[PDB]
Design an enzyme around this catalytic site. Structure first.
Site, short mmCIF file in Angstrom:
data_model
loop_
_atom_site.label_atom_id
_atom_site.label_comp_id
_atom_site.label_asym_id
_atom_site.label_seq_id
_atom_site.Cartn_x
_atom_site.Cartn_y
_atom_site.Cartn_z
N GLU A 148 7.42 6.10 10.23
CA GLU A 148 5.75 5.81 11.29
C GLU A 148 5.64 4.44 12.33
O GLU A 148 4.79 4.94 13.52
CB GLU A 148 4.63 5.39 9.78
CG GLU A 148 4.70 6.15 9.33
CD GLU A 148 4.15 5.97 7.91
OE1 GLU A 148 3.01 4.79 8.34
OE2 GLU A 148 3.57 6.99 6.61
N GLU B 189 0.80 -1.36 -0.01
CA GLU B 189 -0.05 -0.21 -0.58
C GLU B 189 0.50 1.21 -0.62
O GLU B 189 0.59 1.80 -0.23
CB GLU B 189 -0.54 -0.06 1.43
CG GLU B 189 -1.92 1.45 1.13
CD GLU B 189 -2.14 1.38 2.36
OE1 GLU B 189 -1.96 0.88 3.36
OE2 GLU B 189 -3.30 2.36 2.99
N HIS B 190 1.91 1.31 0.26
CA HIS B 190 2.98 2.22 1.02
C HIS B 190 3.48 2.74 -0.56
O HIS B 190 3.60 3.55 -1.68
CB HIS B 190 3.99 2.43 1.55
CG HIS B 190 3.57 2.67 2.87
ND1 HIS B 190 4.51 3.42 3.36
CD2 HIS B 190 3.00 2.44 3.52
CE1 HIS B 190 4.42 4.32 5.17
NE2 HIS B 190 2.92 3.00 4.87
#
Ligand code: HEM
Ligand code: HEM
Lengths: 47, 101, 54, 435, 39, 55, 51, 418, 120
Positions: free
Chosen positions: D136, D59-60
């Protein structure tokens, strides 16, 4: 870092019905609670 | 009306809260509704009530009554707490009615 | 104060022998004790509440 | 027009399946804007310990580059069109959806197809996103709610894939390679496991033809809930976060509606709520009057075959025990002595939440994709309304007793949780001696 | 378009969640977006 | 430091009960009978303990 | 009594009547058991052997 | 159907659109807010926003809260320096009850002393929650520095007034600012006659055109807060235009050319000129966006930057230099067209939701007293010319600057240095 | 604070009684030095010196020289401090003024009881 932690395995202490990680505990919940509460109820009867 | 007023005045004088300088609402039992009503009172009225009650308690401590000139008159007795108590009781009744159904 | 007098009367009657004068007094006194505690006192309090305009 | 007539007038969702198995569903609302996205049946629960973080990594890198449009060309085209490109990854589902004008639907669908299928994974971009993902993971420790919910999943589903976090362990993030990410994409980003959903000005025929044009070139174990507790005690943390749950029904089980009604009955609270003492929820009223809780919320997280049912509350160090007592008391009262009026209030709340969430083209597309994955169908609001109407006090009591009474809870704690009741006391709270 | 919501960079979207009394306030484009990607 | 009367546990209880208890200033002599009742109970206990040594 | 006269309380009574009856039976059995009430216990088959 | 826009004789705009949707939303938009406040009564608007559930003449606080929950509806107050909006949302069947509650709240407030005193604490909690995001503090200080009066007033009660807001001040605010000519009743999912009946039943009593605040004056000052946070949040703004003017549209187009809020999740904001300009110079984490705030009498345009403390000055200067670049005429037609497309899509997406449509209709009714269809707004957007965008950039560059920065100000530049 | 008045009164009266009954030489020396330094420092500058001259003439009828003050201070001993503090502080009815949240302030009977020690 919270992700890194994984709960340590408790299989040694787990009851036989819940030993498997692939089966629902809903089926065995009644049986397990029944065993424990049968112990309790018999104890209370003797008391 | 005059007959009822006369009997009411007789009861007012027979009761001694006037003799001690207290007004009628000063003598009410402090139930939870009365406690909330007192909490809602304006500051001036609350302070006046506190001092009247303290003076009455001091007078009763020495088993004395206030001079007759200073007795609270039946006409001038003001029911300060009654509106706040009525509002509080109305709110409690509304809550109970909601609870009923 | 009527209740206090009634309690004194009940003590006096309980001391006395059961006979014509005492029996009726004791019955009426017991009735009065219960009546004062249960009925007269609350109705009188309500009447006082009305008289004070509360 | 009555509420039922409005529900009946709602435009229907049209579902069609391509030969590869991709399911194309759309709802036409005659609006200038539309939302289109691909909802994939992939996530952490399909990942083993070796590749736990693969989905989040993909997804990144999804919008970073594609083979057809390298690097920022995809981003530049999307921004020039005025569209918004967004993606979310969860334990069970992963979605990429583009918000754009109705006229731009063809290019949006082409871009979504490119992202899903022809996504380049340059090792340089992979390393950059690895740096980002580690930073993150450091950042996400700040979010106490997410940490507590990850703890709840870990303890509740210990030993099962559902316990694994979506982001994945830091070690896997460091050790993930392009080969394994590509393998994950190949294994899980398959046409039969994906849904193309659009809501807005889209026409189902146009969406289907575009999917045929772009998506055609594509390929043709129940978890165990364990009653356990995780306690991370850090006195320095200002407030304590506690999440307690019991196993709930999956997506399919019809009991979800009555349980959602019961959770509506329990309610939610925050310190900035304006109802305060007069709030209908008894637990919320108690929290407001006693200032027990900064925030409190009931959740009904549901997965394919199991779910987490319970509440999350943030409290001061000295208020955890009372809040636990009141929450368990609310659950027990619902199990034993639920009443018709509160059930009616809960049903109205559930109706309002269902209708309000569907408002919005993006929420509609989210619902279409996630329902097609979870239920295999888009449940019409009318069916929801009928099921909600069927619920009554007896149904609520029966369902709560089935899922709440004398059931071992899963508890998670963070912060100054010294006053959090011991597991034996919490478990004893789950049943009533009076009953 | 005659509102601070017209500027969607984020009008400070500082509302607080609530039920039956939820107060919200908005100012104007607030940035704070896309810096969250890096600490 | 602290006052032992206010900080020692038994002295704390005793102080709160009978030394620093906030008491109404207008209580009359009808508020003396209860303490008289406690004194009567203590007196009965002592006199009976001495009587029972011989009964 | 004024407050507890409403539709909800009638519903509340119905919910708890099964529990109250069961507890009442527990008291009835306990009293008969503890007191060995021969009047009640004579009917019970196996316990009847006591007398 | 189509939106029905009616101006009643008292001056109250009622607009209704029947979307035939399960949920009906009705909102009363009042032209009252932080702007319509003076030094003596600062913070009244905030307590008014938090006082929706308090007792009214028609209904008690218990009745309001319990009934709104019983139908499942929601009452919310959304406040903007220039406007205050009360919105009630519920199912179509139960809309009338929430309408009664809303009109009781707005038109018949009984600010009982005890209830108002209770709410005073909630002001501090709400301000603490709002200020957890530093950009709120940054923006409040920015508005304070930019304007001498009116719009300078914060959306949150000043600390010295947290417990000193009086019920009399709330009554005065309601009476002198909650007036018919300053109100708009917009409802989605309700019939026009029903809305007219409700508005006549309740709002008629208050006279229109109440007390009007002074026109905002541009202070052009700098407010700096040293709070020690690692990231410095700074905003450099200049007086741009009032809402509804063509220059306002040019400024919006400029905001999107320089770069509005990001589009691609985890994206580099490649199309955004400011982000690339800053990235060329600064390789640490940073955040740069174009700030455009348009108010009835004035507007602010500028750059908002979040950056590391050491590199904050570099980020601010680079973004300012990019804006200067645009001002000097280095603006491509393709970039202007892309900005126009983004603006139109943004407007359409904003009106996509029920809340967005309601807010937009109310804002248009209050600001202009009329409803403009989205097509006309798009036509206005495309009417903007590249020369106008360049001129707006020139106005920003030449104009006096007002700056607000929060963090380890340290190497953060001053307005004079900029 | 409202809730600390009683403790402060207890400690102040305790210090008074401790000086009256069981004063010690070291603290007496400390007090004498404190008084000497206060006297010397206060009489610094034309305003304080002139004020001292005028007030001493009005009150003492004479300006007591610093040497005389020092001699009188030197005479002071633990015995002298105990005697004077007993004369002025012990079993003497005090005068009390209270302002503000003074509910915790002890009643006059209790304050007077604090003025003497049952041990002594
Ligand atoms: C061995 C028997 C009893 C002892 C030793 C005893 C002792 C006391 C004492 C020391 C007090 C506080 C002092 C006072 O208020 O005067 C008190 C208060 C009180 N007692 Fe008793 N008591 C006894 C029996 C009773 C009985 C038989 C009643 C009622 C039937 C009763 C009702 C009360 C009440 C209502 C108070 C509170 C008085 C007030 O608040 O002004 N007690 N008792
Ligand atoms: C409130 C507490 C008590 C009351 C009201 C009470 C009352 C009485 C009374 C009325 C008598 C009859 C006296 C007589 O007929 O001459 C009596 C006798 C007696 N009681 Fe108590 N009593 C109390 C406590 C005690 C205690 C604590 C003890 C022992 C520890 C005790 C032991 C005795 C004895 C030994 C007698 C026999 C005295 C005799 O025969 O003259 N009593 N009591």
């Amino acid at each position: 870092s919270h992700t890194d932690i994984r709960v340590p395995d408790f299989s040694d202490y787990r009851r036989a019905e819940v030993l498997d990680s692939t089966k629902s505990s809903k089926e065995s919940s009644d049986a397990r609670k029944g065993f424990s509460y049968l112990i309790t109820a018999t104890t209370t009867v003797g008391v | 009306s005059k007959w009822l007023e006369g009997i009411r005045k007789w009861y007012y004088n027979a009761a001694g809260f006037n003799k001690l300088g207290l007004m009628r609402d000063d003598t009410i039992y402090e139930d939870d509704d009365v406690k909330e009503a007192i909490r809602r009172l304006p500051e001036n009225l609350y302070n006046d009530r506190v001092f009247r009650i303290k003076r009455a308690l001091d007078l009763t401590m020495r088993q004395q009554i206030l001079p007759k000139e200073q007795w609270t008159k039946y006409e001038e007795d003001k029911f300060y707490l009654e509106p706040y108590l009525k509002e509080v009781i109305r709110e409690r009744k509304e809550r109970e009615e909601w609870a009923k159904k | 104060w009527m209740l206090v007098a009634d309690l004194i009367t009940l003590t006096w009657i309980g001391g006395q022998p059961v006979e014509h004068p005492f029996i009726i007094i004791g019955q009426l006194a017991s009735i009065l004790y219960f009546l004062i505690i249960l009925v007269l006192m609350p109705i009188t309090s309500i009447i006082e509440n009305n008289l004070l305009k509360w | 027009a009555t509420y039922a007539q409005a529900l009946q007038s709602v435009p229907e969702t049209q579902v069609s399946q391509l030969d590869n198995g991709l399911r194309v569903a759309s709802e036409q609302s005659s609006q200038p804007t539309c939302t289109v996205g691909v909802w994939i049946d992939a996530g952490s629960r399909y990942e083993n310990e070796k590749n736990n973080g693969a989905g989040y990594f993909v997804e990144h890198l999804a919008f970073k580059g594609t083979k057809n449009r390298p690097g920022s060309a995809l981003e530049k085209e999307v921004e020039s069109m005025g569209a918004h490109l967004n993606a979310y990854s969860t334990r069970e589902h992963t979605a990429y959806y583009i918000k754009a004008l109705s006229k731009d639907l063809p290019k949006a669908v082409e871009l979504l197809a490119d992202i899903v299928q022809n996504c380049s994974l340059e090792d340089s971009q992979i390393e950059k996103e690895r740096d980002v993902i580690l930073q993150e993971l450091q950042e996400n420790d700040s979010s106490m709610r997410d940490v507590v919910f990850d703890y709840l999943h870990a303890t509740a589903f210990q030993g099962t894939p559902l316990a694994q976090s979506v982001e994945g362990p830091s070690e896997n993030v460091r050790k993930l390679s392009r080969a394994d990410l590509t393998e994950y994409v190949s294994q899980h980003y398959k046409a039969p496991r994906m849904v193309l959903a659009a809501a807005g000005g889209v026409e189902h025929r146009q969406l289907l033809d575009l999917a045929q044009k772009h998506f055609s070139s594509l390929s043709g174990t129940p978890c165990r809930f364990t009653g356990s507790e995780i306690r991370h005690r850090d006195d320095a943390l200002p407030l304590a976060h506690v999440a307690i749950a019991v196993e709930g029904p999956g997506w399919a089980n019809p009991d979800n509606v009555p349980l959602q009604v019961a959770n509506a009955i329990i309610g939610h609270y925050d310190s900035t709520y304006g109802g305060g003492t007069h709030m209908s929820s008894t637990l919320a009223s108690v929290a407001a009057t006693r200032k027990l809780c900064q925030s409190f919320q009931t959740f009904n997280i549901c997965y394919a075959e199991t779910g987490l049912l319970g509440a999350h509350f943030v409290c001061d160090n000295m208020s955890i025990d009372d809040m636990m007592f009141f929450l368990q008391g609310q659950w027990m009262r619902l199990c034993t002595s639920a009443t018709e009026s509160e059930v009616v209030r809960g049903k109205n709340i559930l109706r309002n939440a269902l209708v309000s969430h569907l408002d919005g083209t993006t929420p509609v597309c989210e619902d279409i994709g996630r329902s097609l994955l979870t239920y295999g169908r888009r449940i019409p609001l009318a069916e929801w309304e009928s099921r909600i109407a069927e619920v009554d006090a007896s149904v609520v009591r029966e369902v709560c007793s089935k899922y709440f009474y004398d059931q071992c809870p899963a508890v998670a704690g963070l912060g100054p949780i010294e006053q959090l009741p011991d597991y034996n006391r919490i478990r004893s709270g789950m049943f009533w001696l009076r009953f | 378009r005659h509102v601070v919501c017209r500027f969607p960079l984020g009008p400070f979207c500082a509302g607080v969640v609530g039920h039956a009394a939820l107060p919200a306030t908005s100012e104007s484009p607030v940035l704070d977006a896309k810096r969250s990607f890096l600490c | 430091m602290t006052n032992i009367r206010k900080s020692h546990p038994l002295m704390k209880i005793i102080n709160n009960a009978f030394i620093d208890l906030p008491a109404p200033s207008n209580i009359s002599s009808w508020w003396n009978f209860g303490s008289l009742l406690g004194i009567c109970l203590i007196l009965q206990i002592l006199t009976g303990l001495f009587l029972a040594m011989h009964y | 009594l004024s407050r507890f006269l409403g539709p909800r309380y009638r519903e509340l009574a119905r919910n708890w009547i099964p529990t109250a009856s069961m507890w009442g039976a527990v008291g009835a059995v306990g009293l008969v058991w503890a007191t060995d009430w021969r009047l009640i216990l004579d009917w019970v088959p196996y316990i009847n052997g006591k007398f | 159907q189509d939106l029905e826009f009616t101006r009643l004789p008292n001056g109250l705009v009622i607009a209704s659109l029947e979307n035939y949707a399960p949920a009906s939303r009705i909102g009363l938009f009042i032209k009252a807010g932080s702007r319509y406040e003076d030094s003596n009564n600062l913070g009244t608007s905030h307590l008014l926003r938090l006082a929706s559930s308090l007792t009214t003449k028609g209904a008690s606080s218990f009745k309001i809260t319990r009934g709104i929950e019983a139908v499942g509806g929601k009452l919310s107050v959304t406040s903007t320096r220039e406007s205050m909006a009360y919105t009630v949302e519920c199912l179509r069947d139960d809309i009338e009850i929430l309408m009664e509650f809303l009109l009781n709240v707005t038109a018949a407030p009984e600010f009982r002393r005890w209830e108002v005193a209770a709410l005073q604490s909630q002001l501090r909690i709400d301000k603490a929650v709002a200020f957890q995001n530093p950009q709120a503090q940054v923006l409040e200080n920015l508005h304070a520095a930019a304007y001498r009066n009116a719009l300078a007033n914060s959306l949150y009660c000043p600390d010295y007034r947290i417990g000193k807001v009086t019920p009399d001040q709330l009554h005065y605010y309601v009476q002198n600012h909650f007036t018919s000519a300053r109100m708009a009743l917009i409802g989605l999912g309700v019939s026009h006659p029903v809305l007219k009946q409700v508005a006549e039943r309740f709002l008629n009593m208050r006279g229109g055109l109440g007390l009007s605040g002074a026109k905002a004056k541009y202070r052009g000052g700098e407010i700096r807060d040293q709070n020690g946070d690692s990231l410095v949040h700074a905003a450099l703004v200049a007086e741009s235009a009032a809402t509804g003017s063509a220059e306002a549209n040019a400024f919006s187009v400029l905001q999107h050319v320089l770069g509005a809020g990001p589009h691609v999740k985890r994206g580099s904001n490649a199309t955004s000129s400011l982000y690339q300009a800053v990235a060329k110079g600064v390789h640490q984490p940073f955040d740069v966006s174009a700030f455009n705030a348009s108010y009835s009498d004035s507007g602010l345009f500028g750059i908002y930057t979040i950056s590391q403390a050491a590199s904050a000055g570099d980020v601010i200067k680079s973004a300012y230099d990019q804006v200067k670049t645009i001002a000097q005429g280095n603006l491509s037609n393709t970039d202007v067209q892309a900005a126009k497309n983004k603006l139109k899509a943004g407007y359409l997406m904003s009106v996509e939701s029920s809340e967005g449509f309601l807010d937009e209709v109310g804002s248009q009714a209050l600001v202009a007293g009329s409803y403009v269809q989205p097509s006309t707004v798009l036509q206005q957007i495309d009417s903007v010319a590249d020369a106008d965008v360049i001129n707006a950039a020139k106005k920003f560059v030449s104009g006096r600057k007002s700056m607000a920065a929060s963090g380890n100000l340290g190497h953060t530049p001053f307005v004079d240095e900029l």
